């Protein structure tokens, strides 16, 4: 019967929204993980420089 | 001869839609909060 159609039409949009709102909750997690990697990959590299310099200095000394 | 059908059905389907939007927001938030807490761990390491 019609109306039960209208109620089978909402419980459908209200999964579309809940599908859209948990396909961003990953996108946030992806870009946050792809951030942290790069926020620690540059840091890894920095310590080498700050250490490559410090030991050379200590060789010369 | 009975407005209670269309009147009181609208105000449940519309209210069911709002609850959908709530746990849409109050969950999408959680992912952003999880992100903050991750990048804190991303320092705890860097300082360690």
Selected residue of A12, A31, A32 to mutate for chain B interface (largest B Cβ count, 10 A): A32
Where are chain A's structural domains? 1-61
Report how far residue A6's alpha carbon sits from residue B9's, in angstroms, rounded to the nearest whole number. 10
- Resolution, rounded to a tenth of an Å? 9.7
Per DSSP, A21 falls in state T
Q: Would you call A46 helix, strand, or coil by DSSP?
A: helix
- Compute the C-alpha angle A28/B30/B15, nearest 5°: 110
Contacts of A39 in chain B (CB under 8 A): 39, 42, 46
Report how far residue A33's alpha carbon sits from residue A30's, in angstroms, rounded to the nearest whole number. 5
Report how far residue A27's alpha carbon sits from residue B4's, in angstroms, rounded to the nearest whole number. 44
Under 8 Å between Cβ of B32 and A28:
yes
Nearest CA in chain A to B43: A40
Contact B42 A39 (CB under 8 A): yes
Q: Experimental method for this entry?
A: cryo-EM
Under 8 Å between Cβ of A2 and B6:
no
Contacts of A29 in chain B (CB under 8 A): 31, 34-35
Instruction: Please state, in angstroms and as integers, the Cα–Cα distance from residue A34 to each residue in A9, A24, A27, B17, B47, following that order.
Output: 38, 15, 10, 34, 19
CATH of A1-61, one of 1.10.20.140, 3.30.565.10, 1.10.287.3510, 1.20.5.620: 1.20.5.620
Per DSSP, A2 falls in state T
Report how far residue A30's alpha carbon sits from residue A24's, in angstroms, rounded to the nearest whole number. 9
Length of chain B as a residue count: 48
Under 8 Å between Cβ of A32 and B33:
no
Report how far residue B33's alpha carbon sits from residue A41's, in angstroms, rounded to the nearest whole number. 23
């Amino acid at each position: 019967k019609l109306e039960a159609i209208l109620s089978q039409e909402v419980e459908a949009e209200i999964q579309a929204l809940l599908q859209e709102a948990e396909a961003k909750a990953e996108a946030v997690k992806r870009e946050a993980e792809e951030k942290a990697k790069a926020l620690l990959q540059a840091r890894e590299r920095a310590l080498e420089a700050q250490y490559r310099a410090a030991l050379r200095r200590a060789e010369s000394a | 001869g009975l407005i209670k059908s269309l009147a009181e059905k609208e105000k449940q389907l519309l209210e069911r839609l709002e609850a959908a939007k709530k746990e849409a927001e109050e969950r999408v938030k959680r992912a952003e909060a999880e992100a903050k807490a991750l990048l804190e761990e991303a320092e705890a390491k860097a300082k360690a």
